[PDB]
Amino acid sequence: AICCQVDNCGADLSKVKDYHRRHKVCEIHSKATTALVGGIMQRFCQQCSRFHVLEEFD
Ligand SMILES: [Zn+2]
């Protein structure tokens, strides 16, 4: 049972099966627009499957 890496998110990654638990992240931030990880806002990608600052994102 892993928890979401994003701050202010105590989502339990136990219900999931994979992917979301592999990169440590719930389903919300997984397909969300803005996320808080460490301190700087970012957006989780689907194709690349990894967190990244939303400085260049659309
Ligand atoms: Zn989350």
CATH of the domain at 7: 4.10.1100.10
Are 17 and 37 in contact by the 8 Å Cβ rule? The answer is: no
| Dihedral sign computed on CA atoms, order 16, 18, 31, 34 | positive
Dist. CA 37 → ligand 1 center (Å): 10
Dist. CA 53 → ligand 1 center (Å): 16
Domain that holds residue 43: 1-58
Number of domains comprising the chain? 1
Task: Enumerate the known binding-site residues for Zn(2+).
Answer: 4, 9, 26, 29, 45, 48, 52
Three-state secondary structure readout of the chain: CEECCCCCCCCEECCCCCCCCCCCCCHHHHCCCCEEECCEEECCCCCCCCCCECCCCC
Structure solved via:
NMR
